[PDB]
Symmetry: D2
Subunit: 319 residues, 4 copies
């Protein structure tokens, strides 16, 4: 029988004997995702082109998530890609939770109408101190909930908590996220590798050899296919649904990768581990990295466990 995100999250809160504060936070996030979706699909674009005779989506998306998270009364510290410093919620609206998000991921793909998305990770504040930026410098092991919305051919919200990974399709006729994939697990091994090979000149030798194994298998088998949308949400989601591997490794220029630990790599690493996949920087599990800067980058290699393991094997040889 049918299940909605609103009802699924409410029942989970009841099972967990929560006070309803994280439930209100998720409710507010789901609302914001729906309004971002509506804007990404360009509803109302006709009023921008004179049909009756204004703000970039990056900014609007951030404002939507910021205001909805603030007005939830569930959050104290908010970290966003769009903000230099962490936002400390005024004390009247303060709750226990720390949220790191990317309100619109995939900026290079906005103008060509390729898939984009929203990423989020949720922490419970651990300090006794006044809430500050330091409450967001937790390792991803500490995540309480994380996931993303994909604004692709359809809009899907993927939500991961300790109970597992669940996928919800947004039905736009009724503005309702519908549970369509329950307790999702990733394939043990896939057949697609995903990275920007235009950086090949700057590749670490382990990355160079790994990719070469994908195109010219030593085990006679057939070569992997290649995909790279250029939007982390789209590429990571395909990895979940299809299996395979995704890599934004440290290249000569970016010696710590490009993607941001708090609101891109950690949320995706958490979805992956909860789905029976893996997420490594090469040196360690992504969720084991202890950050020191809220905007700090990390290298990320993630996906099916047989694939990540094969990469790590190559990486160990080279180190």
């Amino acid at each position: 029988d049918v299940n909605t995100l609103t009802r699924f999250v409410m029942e989970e809160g009841r099972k967990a004997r929560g006070t309803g504060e994280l439930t209100q936070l998720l409710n507010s996030l789901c609302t914001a995702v729906k309004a971002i979706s509506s804007a990404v699909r360009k509803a109302g674009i006709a009023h921008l082109y004179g049909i009756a005779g204004v703000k970039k989506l990056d900014v609007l998306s951030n404002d939507l998530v910021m205001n909805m998270l603030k007005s939830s009364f569930a959050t104290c510290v908010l970290v966003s890609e769009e903000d230099k410093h962490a936002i400390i919620v005024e004390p009247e609206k303060r709750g226990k939770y720390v949220v790191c998000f990317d309100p619109l991921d995939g900026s290079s793909n906005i103008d060509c109408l390729v898939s984009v998305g929203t990423i989020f990770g949720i922490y419970r504040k651990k300090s006794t101190d006044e809430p500050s930026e330091k409450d967001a410098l937790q390792p991803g092991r500490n995540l309480v909930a994380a996931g993303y919305a994909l604004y692709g051919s359809a809009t899907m919200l993927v939500l991961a908590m300790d109970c597992g990974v669940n996928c919800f399709m947004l039905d736009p006729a009724i503005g309702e996220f519908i549970l369509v994939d329950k307790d999702v697990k990733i394939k043990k091994k896939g057949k697609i590798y995903s990275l920007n090979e235009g950086y090949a000149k700057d590749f670490d030798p382990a990355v160079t050899e790994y990719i070469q194994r994908k195109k010219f298998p030593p085990d006679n088998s057939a070569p992997y296919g290649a995909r790279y949308v250029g939007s982390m949400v789209a590429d990571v989601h395909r990895t979940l649904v299809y299996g395979g591997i995704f890599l934004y490794p440290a290249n000569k220029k970016s010696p710590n990768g490009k993607l941001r630990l708090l609101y891109e790599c950690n949320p995706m690493a958490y979805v992956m581990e909860k789905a029976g996949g893996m997420a490594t920087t090469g040196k360690e599990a992504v969720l084991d990295v202890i950050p020191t800067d809220i905007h700090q980058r990390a290298p990320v290699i993630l996906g099916s466990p047989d694939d990540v393991l094969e990469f790590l094997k190559v990486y160990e040889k080279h180190s």
Copy 2:
């Protein structure tokens, strides 16, 4: 001054001194595209999941186009990816046009929600009385119009005719395509290359060398960036919008290429040429291939003229 697709096409038809039959065909196709977009964005999916207590998308898309074109009274021969032979329109609903289309391109990977699209090409028939599939076996240079709808982060219709290429954004709030880019032209030279490098082991020596020049430039310029969504409409539309080059060349599993000439390669070659770009098979312009089978494949290299020229210099070396 605001303009819609319905009004734009109608005025261009008045300037053309058309009898209205092609305009009626194009209205019908755009209605179909709006209904494909709705299904693709998963409107009503809550009913499939039991909200009140099943046709595949590409089958439903085909039915939408087939029915809207037949009932336009403008067509006589219809070629689709999903039908073995050409559909001859029943006599009472016959007009003069031939339409070759892919109703849902990239549809095999719809399961991961990556962008998807509809591609179409329109010809005037050559036959005089009974139409046949011979009316579809024309070279792309005979196209009267061609285009595509992209179901991406937003839905956009790109329409090309002799007058040039125009882009329309679907405003879902009112179901109108809004003219947002008129008389579009690709940039002379781009910075993105797009192909499935997973087939590298099977590349012709010309493709191997060209891709090598993009990753390790001879003149030590910046290497190109790589993008491969895996859906032709998405990869081609980005090529139109951002410039660069898109390749689906011959490999082992596909020695004449994989993409279909009539309703994948030819309509995109036409869009590209009308925007000042190029589309080649390597040996000849795509639009000059004379087809002998409605489902025949063709290699395709397309995009910015400087990039396609640079590929063709490498190709002529290996003749």
Copy 3:
């Protein structure tokens, strides 16, 4: 065969051998109506209530019809209830048609969410001097097309021409008006009467007597049911679809009624007659009044011919 409003107007124009100007006018009206429908249904209301941390509907509606008609290149004079003088279209955008319209009928009614609508009538300019207000002072008999959009439980457009009356339902999933009632004809006699009985103290004695025959039928048949939405478009649409009588009659406090001749009475009077109905002031056919003010009022009694004739019999008796 499925038919859309666009395709139906377009084929009607080709059958009438029109040059495309009227078709372009109606296309523009269609687009404006879908945009009004969207604002009436409160799309985007969440932004006015600060979800991301402003025209009134009658004003927005007027701007939409005004802008879409001007940019149609099909009109020279535009009369609106929201503007004191006729609007003269700038010479570069001038067509040959005169449009009188009420952009959002049902004022008493917006705040309580009851049905509202748009009424329009279209004349061809008869004079050969430069477009002026006098070009709109034509009797309804000269109408080339008229009709209305109803924003009710669903949105529907009713379009009347010489060919007859047709009804189109707006499907909001795809933003297409769908032909659902062709060549509509009104019942010869209804069972509903529609007027504001709160004015009973001021009624013309004929209206008093006529309403008494509907509550106390002298043949001892069933009394009529009463319905008075208070929104002309809703009450007259129901009159059209169910049969019956709608009255906004002259009393002595308002010897010309309340409703406006040019953009309320004449359009519904024309829709009625083309459906086999009637529409009278009590003294003459509404469509036969020669207006002298673009805002002059007219009494109306309209609906099923048996009912209207029943009323005129009572009216003649009081003379």
Copy 4:
């Protein structure tokens, strides 16, 4: 700050320190209302008219409320205009609440696109017996919550509880009910009376005299205006919003009134009293009537307190 129905209801639930069962109940109802709204506005009607080559709205709406309420796990007994006997939820899905509802109200107005609605009343099961139709025969006084959805020019949900009455506007761009009117109170005295005067021949003398005081005021102030949409939800909501009085008194076809006590009269009476208005049968307060039949009928007079009292004075004089 912006507030949604999902967030308001959850916050009121946390305050009352509920277990979340009632909150799940209202969530499911909210989702059903949205899906009914989408069907009422004829989303997807194009597919019913053959765009690609079914129930009455009554049945579908019932199936939507019925299935959503069952799957909430919050209910044990369900009573609906569309079902002869009370439905007893299977024990695995049983909660403690009893819900009586009209899933689509205003049946005579469906076909002419006039406003229609949904009405609901929520009781807690008092008896500790096996759940039965008996558990629904409580007087309105015992109502935990009630309200209605109006599918008018826009869709609005009106929800009443001990805490008061609140109004939520459906934003269809995002499928979210947005709090727009808080703690609503009706005017002390209105200027509109609402009833079907078609039954004038059957009215009792109290009703006849009250209506005569509204058309011919003894104090010689201005007569009230008349409005009768013919859908109870629409007329009752205009009564809440503008003030005045709504009447469905006994007539010859309906000697105990037409409107039904459990799922029409009691919810609207409850909303009225929580807003500072009144609702009587003429003999008692609606909320005081102890029902013996789940489909039993009652006459009803409701609106601004002064108007209901002025009618009651007339009713008292006629004794």
